[PDB]
Amino acid sequence: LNDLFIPETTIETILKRLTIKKNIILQGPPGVGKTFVARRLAYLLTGEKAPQRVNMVQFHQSYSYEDFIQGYRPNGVGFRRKDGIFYNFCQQAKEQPEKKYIFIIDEINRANLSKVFGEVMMLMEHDKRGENWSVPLTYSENDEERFYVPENVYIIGLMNTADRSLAVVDYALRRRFSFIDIEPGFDTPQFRNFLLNKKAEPSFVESLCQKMNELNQEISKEATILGKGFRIGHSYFCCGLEDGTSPDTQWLNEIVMTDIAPLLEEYFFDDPYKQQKWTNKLLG
Template sequence: MIADTLSRFVAQADEGTDLRTSDYPNTFQELKMKVSFGQGNYAKVPWIAIVSYGQEVQKGIYPVLLYFKSSGILILAYGISETNVPEVDWQAGQSEPTIAQYFRDEFQSVPERYGQSRIRNIYRVADGLDFKAMANDVEGIVAAYRDEMKGRAQGEFEESTELESYTPEDAIEDLFVDRQKFDLMLYLLREKKNIILQGPPGVGKTYFSKQLAYALLGQKDPDRVGMVQFHQSYAYEDFVQGYRPSGDGFQLRDGIFFQYCTKARQDFSRDYVFIIDEINRGNLSKIFGELMLLIEADKRGTDWEIPLAYSSGPDERFSIPENLYLIGLMNTADRSLAMVDYALRRRFGFVDLEPGFETDQFKEFLVRRGTDEHFLDRVINRLMIVNQRIAEDQANLGKGYRIGHSFFCSLPKGHSLDLAHYRRIVQWEIEPLLREYWFDNPDKAESLIKELMLVD
């Protein structure tokens, strides 16, 4: 198994065009396995690392296979993090040369990276690679790692409960968007502090917002990502502060956003994200009240504290902390809603999420799950035709009403998208949508439904 993984890793590294790692195994012998070909640009030294016992590639020690492509060698090493100095050190491999020493002696140069890690094995690509032998070597260093780490005092690994790092590369593995656009979204969120992700039904806005939030935080930490859903009855008293029945009378209670601001303020060294689903379903001016001022990026912090509607006096003030970021989600196909309040609109950056049927990631996502590629090509073709018809109907619909890809991504575990499953999705989820779109033109809706059902 690991031999096949090593062979595939080298082939993908040699190709030098594909950064994706989502379908590599996540574990090896019950330890975490991580693979990297770079972030945004292709790495000069792709790697496979085995990490556990509280160690991470950013801070720790771990067995690692490094592919120095420009030198034509792979090195299996006693890995040592470069980003942060690890709190522990290898006991094994102390007598072995470092990668920096080897490069100095062999090539009279310095390695691109990982110079302090010590060498266990070297494999020259020109001599041919025996992946079974390499697999045995990997198993050997992992066994040494396991024995060494288990033999240490438990107190050395108190940091094992810490969350793993989460990068933009991790985020886009299952998002049908390119790295450049995702980076622009992250930049906008950091600069503006408030963004709205808007798009047609089924483009995965909720899922996307969570991945964007984790990428901003640098960790997959649900405790630092809050969420609420607006609706027509939602009010300032629910969101910020207001009186609620309590016993024989009423009591002033803090709303969910007030509470979350307090939580973020008390942990100012770390960022927090608050997601508002269906943000355009509520009366935004009524819900936000005086927070319309405070959510602006340059109005954050204690310098801009103001009394709230229910403050007991002018000295009781409130502010939104600088480490809190807002992500709103908006369905562009909801006919019942008015445009977003213009006063609020200028305080948010707006990002369009598009249906992902045309992306390579969508096709690869379903093919990896066993979907027949020829059948999938037919499905994609029909969906794109229907979306084109929707976009062309500028009088009643438009691009904001197109069908999203996520209808076809929530497959039961171990299932592929076959004809029967596809038709059920169309019948139960997409057909009602199309009939609503063309309620005054049922013949057109029927023809498009027939088109999607693959009835030729």
């Protein structure tokens, strides 16, 4: 709650929303600390920095229901039914009901979220958690053995908003997930206070926010193609200055050409002049 660059209100909104709803999606562009919030946040909700409770995974298009929950895979002797992580993870929290166990899914947008989750796409809802709503799995040999989400389990979803796929839209999953936007937060003092507590110049910081925000506003100008979801995150500035190199315009000049320019190219594709303009605008 000290080194975080996002407002206290949003996290205060989140914790009540998470505790009530038990499922959330933190959606924003890359470089806004989606991972760091969730890792920090789970430790807040547990109240202790216990990593065994928390497990993180990063989805990808080839990820499958075989990997996540159950699946048939080979031992040394031959093939067997291999309990996937979430079945293994829910058992871990099922062992200890009192504590809050957390599961984080990164790059969620890429995969067919329905495909992987499958049976739990119904069960994950906060009300339908318990033995009453248990169901036999696909690969379960007998109907009697079933799987039910425990009440303590909470799920957090981290989604990149800059690569929309107009392939499958599911509004039913959207019912399961309470969606929370995250702004980059250049305007926030907490981001600035970190840098001003890193021997930054006061003008250098203030002019920078003016520079980045104008770029961010242009990206949000044309809502159809791009939006707030595409706009630039801050996290590039966090790393690389803890060595001891104090802020300077030279330091920024590295990041602009190193990092932002391909992003600009990606976004403002087949428009070099706009890249030259917005690239050069920042440097001055």
